[PDB]
């Protein structure tokens, strides 16, 4: 029941969800290859708990928006995001997803927070694979409830808990 209502139990389940981040592959653009390189045999996102990679949205919690989110893919991704279990986290990978990138035009959503609740933002073009590990570590200590912004605020464990989805 939501991972709450005991001081030890919420710490425990937050620990589990933090290190057991099961990525949901959503490769969009050239960010995708520097995403996969965070799993190659120089630098693997295969230690923290993300070795296995369930392409299914019904089985993976972290959605890595790796590339430009073109508008014709937005509504589809929409349902794909709703086709995730509720304990889900959404990372915005790359400049084109986090921001509009250099493609300031009619074609691209200029910030993916519009359609999906973003957990962590990561600048870069392409973000070095180790920066992707840094972003998942950021998300790690966020879902543990150990993350603070520049204004001093603690951030909720799971973004996408605060939106009247519909």
């Amino acid at each position: 029941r939501e991972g709450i209502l005991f001081t030890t139990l919420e710490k425990l389940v937050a620990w589990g969800r933090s290190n057991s981040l099961w990525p949901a592959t959503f490769g969009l653009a050239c960010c995708a290859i520097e995403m996969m390189a965070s799993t190659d045999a120089r630098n693997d996102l295969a230690r923290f708990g993300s070795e296995v990679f369930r392409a299914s949205p019904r089985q993976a919690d972290v959605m890595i928006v790796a590339g430009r989110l073109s508008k014709k893919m937005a509504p589809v991704m929409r349902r794909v995001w709703e086709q995730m279990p509720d304990p889900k986290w959404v990372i915005s990978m790359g400049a084109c997803a986090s921001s509009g990138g250099m493609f300031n035009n009619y074609a691209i959503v200029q910030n993916v927070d519009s359609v999906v609740p973003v957990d962590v933002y990561v600048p870069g073009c392409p973000p070095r694979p180790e920066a992707l590990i840094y972003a998942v570590m950021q998300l790690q200590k966020k879902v543990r409830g150990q993350a603070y912004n520049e204004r001093g605020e603690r951030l909720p464990p799971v973004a996408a808990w605060k939106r009247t989805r519909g």
Binding site: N19, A41, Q59, P87
Partner: protein, 353 residues
């Protein structure tokens, strides 16, 4: 069960419960070991993380698995959707008790095994059919024909090789003359390592078990990068875990049975220690099978069915008929050693062209 004793029923329940929880912890740590061995295969190293040895990552994964929004999909069957994992798991756990882990009493007083049925291989075969049952049933229940075709692939291929399993298993019965695994094991103690007599059948059994979810048809199928498989794609929290668990238990059950019947299920001529040799041979078959997992491609379920039907089953039935010739005329047992050695030399020397 002429020569084997019986523990009390409460001890039967205790031993069954211990076997189940052992299978749980075992498949978890074996998922870890498979990941790390794959890593060694592909230069990349495994999770030096949450452990030290990673041996606490499975607990984190399970703790996430619960609380993971076990969802009842709309447009799906209310009942079968939830019910099928119970079949796939239950009828997977069992069919492991028969495997002898030692002589009677080597369980610190009572019994290495759980049950020693008179007709064992039939029990294994019957409950083996039910794993495929649960698989394709889950494939249907999703109400997604996307996964449905994968479930059909599963059932078709596994059932073909499941038939082949019978023609494989026929032959050693002629030598042993009993359908209890323990008598076969004692035979392997006396005459020695049954596979020396029936290596081809062993192959067509081994290869058959490769089709039974280990890998390489690998049209088991899984969703990844192809027409999605059955028993997944709609389950979220525990039922998906239940399916992966049952498939891995089927894997380890085959990887333990193969040394049990043909090779030396424990019964070692050396040091004759009850448990360690059996566990070591299980782990050996695991190492080879994982080598195959991260070393061989798919067979597409078309060439796989053609191969199973045209190659495995005629060969297995022919070997059974030959063994039946020798047993019915019953004069030698050496003739089978000679013919099996020749057969192995054929299936091996034909490669190095």
């Amino acid at each position: 069960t002429w020569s084997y004793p019986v523990d009390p029923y409460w001890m039967v329940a205790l031993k069954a419960l211990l076997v189940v929880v052992g299978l749980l912890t075992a498949f978890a740590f074996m998922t870890l070991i498979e990941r790390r061995l794959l890593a060694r295969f592909q230069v990349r190293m495994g999770p030096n993380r949450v452990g030290p040895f990673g041996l606490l990552q499975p607990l984190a994964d399970a703790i996430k698995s619960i609380f993971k929004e076990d969802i009842v999909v709309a447009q799906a069957d209310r009942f079968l959707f939830v019910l099928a994992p119970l079949i796939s798991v239950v009828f997977a756990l069992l069919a492991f008790g028969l495997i002898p882990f030692g002589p009677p009493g080597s369980f610190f007083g009572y019994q290495p095994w759980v049950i020693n049925l008179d007709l064992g291989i039939l029990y294994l075969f019957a409950v083996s059919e039910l794993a495929v049952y649960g698989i394709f049933l889950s494939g249907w229940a999703s109400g997604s024909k996307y996964s449905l075709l994968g479930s059909l692939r599963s059932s078709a291929s596994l059932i073909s090789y499941e038939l082949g399993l019978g023609l494989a298993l026929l032959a050693p019965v002629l030598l042993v003359g009993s359908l209890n695994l323990n008598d076969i094991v004692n035979w392997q103690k006396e005459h020695g390592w049954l596979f020396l007599y029936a290596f081809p059948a062993f192959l067509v059994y081994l290869i058959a078990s490769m089709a039974e979810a280990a890998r390489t048809p690998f049209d088991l199928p899984e969703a990844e990068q192809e027409l999605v498989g059955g028993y997944h794609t709609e389950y979220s929290s525990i039922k998906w875990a239940l399916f992966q668990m049952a498939e891995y238990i089927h894997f380890i059950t085959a990887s333990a049975l193969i040394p049990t019947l043909f090779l030396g299920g424990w019964t070692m001529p050396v040091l004759e220690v009850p448990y360690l040799w059996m566990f070591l041979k299980i782990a050996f078959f695991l190492f080879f099978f994982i080598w195959i997992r991260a070393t061989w491609f798919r067979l597409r379920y078309d060439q796989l069915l053609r191969f199973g039907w045209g190659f495995l089953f005629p060969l297995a039935l022919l070997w059974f008929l030959v063994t039946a010739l020798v047993v019915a005329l019953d004069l030698p047992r050496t003739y089978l050693l000679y013919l099996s050695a020749l057969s192995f030399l054929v299936l091996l020397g034909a490669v190095l062209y």
